[PDB]
C-alpha cells in the first residue's frame, strides 16, 4: 500500500509517508501571467540534445520514463536562471482521462491535456543520487501538451507503448531524438520547486515553457492504454497521473520574455 493517484492514496495523502509534500517550495504550482515578472537578468536559455543518446523506455507504475545514458556529457541544459552544466536523465509525461486536465503546471489556472518533464541533473554533484539532496540538484524542463496536430517527433515513443503496457516492463529505445518534441519558441517561467512525485524533494529548478506543443487525440489515447497495474492484475488504466497546483508561498515566478 503505497502513494498513487487513486482516492486512497492520491496526492492529498501523499505528506503522512512524506511530510515535505506540505513544504514551502513544493511543485507543482498555478503561473499567474500577470504577476509573472520579466527577469533582465536571466541568461540565454541553452538546450543541447545533438548528442543525446536514449536507451530504454520504462513503465514504472507512475509513468513511463525515456532513458538516457547520463554516463557523460552530452545531452545538456545550461544557462537561463542555470548555473553551471545540466545532463539529461529522462523524460516522462503526465496527462489525463480527459483532454481538459492532465498537466501539474497550470497557467492563469488552465489545465493542459499533458505535459512533458525533461530531467537533468547537476554535474557538479557528481550523480543523480546527490543531486537530489541539493536544492539546485534537478534542473527540470516543462512543456505542455494541448490536443490538435499530431507531432511527428513523438509517434516513435506512441508505437513502442503497447509492447510496456504494465508496471515493470521496459523496452529498448535507442537512438531517439529528444529535440522533436520542443515548440518552436524557448520563452519560459521559472522558479525553484520540488520533485513532483514521492520523495518530493525540493532539489529542482523549474523552467516551463510558455508555447506548448500539439498532439493528437490519436496520440494522446495511446498514453491512455497504458496501466498502473502489473502484469496480469486488474487493469487499473494509467491517466491522471498528475499532482494537482501547490501553494506558492514565498516564491515568485520569473518570466524570461516581456
Ligand atoms: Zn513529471
Known amino acids: 500500500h503505497h502513494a498513487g493517484y487513486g482516492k486512497h492514496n492520491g496526492p492529498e495523502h501523499w505528506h503522512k509517508d512524506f511530510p ?42 507512475w509513468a513511463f520514463n525515456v532513458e538516457f545514458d547520463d554516463s557523460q556529457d552530452k545531452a545538456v541544459l545550461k544557462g537561463g536562471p542555470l548555473d553551471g552544466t545540466y545532463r539529461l536523465i529522462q523524460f516522462h509525461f503526465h496527462w489525463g482521462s480527459l483532454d481538459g486536465q492532465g498537466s501539474e503546471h497550470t497557467v492563469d489556472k488552465k489545465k493542459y491535456a499533458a505535459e512533458l518533464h525533461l530531467v537533468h541533473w547537476n554535474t557538479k554533484y557528481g550523480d543523480f543520487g546527490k543531486a537530489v539532496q541539493q536544492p539546485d540538484g534537478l534542473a527540470v524542463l516543462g512543456i505542455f501538451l494541448k490536443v490538435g496536430s499530431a507531432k511527428p517527433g513523438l509517434q516513435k515513443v506512441v508505437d513502442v507503448l503497447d509492447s510496456i503496457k504494465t508496471k515493470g516492463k521496459s523496452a529498448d529505445f535507442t537512438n531517439f531524438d529528444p529535440r522533436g518534441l520542443l515548440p518552436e519558441s524557448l520563452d519560459y517561467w521559472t522558479y525553484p520547486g520540488s520533485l513532483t512525485t514521492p520523495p518530493l524533494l525540493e532539489c529542482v529548478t523549474w523552467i516551463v515553457l510558455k508555447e506548448p506543443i500539439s498532439v493528437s ?4 489515447l495511446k498514453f491512455r492504454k497504458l496501466n498502473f497495474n502489473g502484469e496480469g492484475e486488474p487493469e487499473e488504466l494509467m491517466v491522471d497521473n498528475w499532482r494537482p497546483a501547490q501553494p506558492l508561498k514565498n516564491r515568485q515566478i520569473k518570466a524570461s520574455f516581456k
Open 20 to 61: 515535505i509534500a506540505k513544504g514551502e517550495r513544493q511543485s507543482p504550482v498555478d503561473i499567474d501571467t500577470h504577476t509573472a515578472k520579466y527577469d533582465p537578468s536571466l541568461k540565454p536559455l541553452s538546450v543541447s540534445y545533438d548528442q543525446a543518446t536514449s536507451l530504454r523506455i520504462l513503465n514504472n507504475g
Open 217 to 220: 487525440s490519436e496520440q494522446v
